Amino acid sequence: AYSFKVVLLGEGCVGKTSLVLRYCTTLQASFLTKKLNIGGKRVNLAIWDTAGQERFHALGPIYYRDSNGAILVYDITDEDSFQKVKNWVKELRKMLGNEICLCIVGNKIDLEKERHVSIQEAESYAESVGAKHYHTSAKQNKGIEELFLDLCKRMIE
């Protein structure tokens, strides 16, 4: 019954593509789908990748329109990538419609030795904007399933 649009945010270098490929010969990784069953309820998930480069900054809203959820990926070793998430959240929160369900995803937790964004800053930021924070490692296939499962739960609620 439920059909959900989920936008994916981040530059290529934060490893967003590996993350969604993990979850979902592949021709393209820009539009991706999953059919899910949650509490005997059927869920159609569509993942809409959005161009993360600075030159495309004004285009976000066109992509974000009518989203049900958003997955904002940053690289835990790159504080600039986290700063980008905070600006994206501001945009997502100005979208006309219902509250988009936000995930703030700290990727490459396999490089925790080299992390620049503290767990406390990331989780406290997420709470402040009504988002949820997740740790993932596309490299080691951790946290990916939990993220998408939880988001759908949240989008149903």
Add this chain to the structure above:
Amino acid sequence: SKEFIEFLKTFHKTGQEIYKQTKLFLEGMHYKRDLSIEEQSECAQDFYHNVAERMQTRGKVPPERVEKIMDQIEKYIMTRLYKYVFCPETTDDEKKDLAIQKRIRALRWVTPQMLCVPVNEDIPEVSDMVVKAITDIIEMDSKRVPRDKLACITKCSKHIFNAIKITKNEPASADDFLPTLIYIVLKGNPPRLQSNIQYITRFCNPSRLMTGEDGYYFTNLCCAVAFIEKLDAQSLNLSQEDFDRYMSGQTSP
């Protein structure tokens, strides 16, 4: 038109009701022809909304066949409405078409390298994909039904995806895809581009655009056009000196 009737006859005391409601809507549109295109579009969209719901309620039809018949409805109504609601004289659709056409023409000098396009046109198979993608986006204007215009955008995107995958040997992300679609649009300068976009927005069955692949590719086309409209020296990593020289039409990059 004959096919629509024969199609609906299949559905018994649900097909007659849809036909009546479709005829009512179309009669409503005739008496709205002198209203604004916004008002005409709201009418069609309400109609899509209401016919779909009145099928789930007082009809009991499986959601599989529901999409299939909404496609038939859209084709009947839009085939009949096209001459009246595509690029209407009461709108700035023509004005917008000319401005984007002139803008795309002005930017004929922009290279794929400037846009960081991940396609290598020296590979014959890539070159063939690019040729097809340009033809796909050009063909959009030749189709009357929003679903068929969307199919051109979607075909174009998949030919682009092939071009990128052959060049890079990795599946395109949005970061790979969008600059390539921008480049294809710049090369194609597709006829009546804004009129096609406005028509799809105004008259496409609103559902097909919401989550599924046609919606994604259409959204990307919208992003491409918006980028092209505001493109500046900084967009292409150029000095104002070089950008202005290229814009004069007097200098090759």
